[PDB]
């Protein structure tokens, strides 16, 4: 007869506790929010014994796994409630044709640019060599971003025809792995051309790109909402916008959906449903959490319409709606490792873009 | 693993005198990186005319292609570098060479709106086509060759006229 909630320590868990106080005030039911470290490992471990939180918050990619182990109850929102959230977010939490979590927030890479260096940011990847030429003449660069992790280089590689797995029949298509095709090759070759012409350096990682942007050295960077804070401190006059297109098509960044699942072993499933749908997933509920620590863009249409008055959040959702939902699937790890090595090999000139891509698939 | 590296760097950076002393100390003028980018590539791409000149004077492979299929003529064409293009053409840059997309320096020049560039490239292709004709016209000894090649340098306006003669000559100098 109570609710225990787990959510990570970088979230607005105190705002979430306020929603819990309102819930108690209305129903008498006490709501306890905790933020154990490594809770994404703790939860499957203790849920396997019938323990843990009634409700767990985490990135959707992990929930496929939990569902597999029978740790996550099926959620039953009626179609009226489902219509209150953006439809593509319900796909991040669908597994074997059953909804297994409530989407809360939406996370994607955006183009971040220095408004001082670059008032009108490029709409295309194609313009960027030109811009770098201009900027290099006065001791700046156009663009620096993490070239080491596929997560960052994938939205370009995906844009002309790349894909991790296609979403046939609500589930994933595990048969066609889209790292060896013509659209991906074109993506990676444009990247490799940036590198060999000296517009970018292959050894640029996350720390190097962030420092470079946050010190005024580069006109643009590619990162996510988690990075906004450091830029805020740096006092660079930045804005955040739509990712540039390549061969006319949108850059497709992977989407992360912060989701709330109900413990399969919970005796408070209706309470938890009640809490999530009619307390948290409301304008006032997400607001409470968001004031404590910003959610970024949200799945709830009513509240996202408000937050989107911040252009950065708007860009985050526009890029999300243009990207691909992060596969909640196990063989994503094989994918990442393959993609990761294919990019390093190509960006290093170790392998041609051709050999590099067909190899990371065998 | 020594001078070639320093040279690619100095070429990229446009440090003229640094490039020239590396040369005078024996650097491979055609040193490549892991993309097969040569110093001549970087200087062409980055607009360093004097360096382009210096490298060519030292025997830089004017038609080198990197692993990606680009030639320095391709690279220079994208930025409308007239001088650079002119001097590569002087050292034998290949107006017919095609990049990854099947493009010539002329196609690129047309793509980027660079009319001045397209013109130079255009009349170079035409005068070379003329030169090449003369040189492979079978019924011409090495004398009559020079006679025509010279008269094509001294009047590139009457060129098409002149080719027509070289051919009717070739047809009268044949077993007809």
Residue numbers in the entry:
A (entry chain B): 5 to 366
B (entry chain A): 12 to 135, 1218 to 1269
Task: Please quote the authors directly.
Here we propose a novel method for connecting the pre-existing α-helices of two proteins into a single extended helix using a chemical cross linker. EY-CBS (3,3′-ethyne-1,2-diylbis-{6-[(chloroacetyl)amino]benzenesulfonic acid}) is a chemical cross linker that can react simultaneously with two cysteines in the i and i+11 positions of the α-helix19. To test whether EY-CBS detects the formation of a helix, we chose two amino acid residues separated by 11 amino acids in the proposed fusion helix and mutated them to cysteines. In conclusion, we have developed a new method that can convert two pre-existing α-helices into one long extended helix.
We chose an artificial ankyrin protein, named ‘mbp3-16', that has been engineered to bind maltose-binding protein (MBP), and the B4 domain of protein A as a model system to test our fusion helix method. To verify fusion of the helices, we crystallized the 3,311 fusion protein before and after reaction with EY-CBS and determined the structures of the two products. Since the ankyrin domain, mbp3–16, had been engineered to bind MBP, we were able to use MBP to facilitate crystallization. In the crystal structure, one MBP molecule interacted exclusively with the mbp3–16 component of the hybrid protein and there was no interaction with either protein A or the fusion helix. The electron density map calculated using the refined protein structure showed a clear density corresponding to the EY-CBS, and one EY-CBS molecule could be modelled into the density. Both reactive ends of the EY-CBS are covalently linked to the cysteines in the fusion helix. In the crystal structure, the fusion helix adopts a nearly ideal α-helical structure and matches closely to the intended structure. The Cα atoms of the cysteines are separated by 16.8 angstrom and the mutated alanines are located under the phenyl rings of EY-CBS, as designed. The structures of the ankyrin and protein A domains are easily superimposable on those of the isolated proteins, which demonstrates that the helix fusion has no impact on the structure of the protein other than near the fusion site. The sulfate moieties of the EY-CBS groups form nonspecific ionic interactions with three lysine groups of the protein A and ankyrin domains.
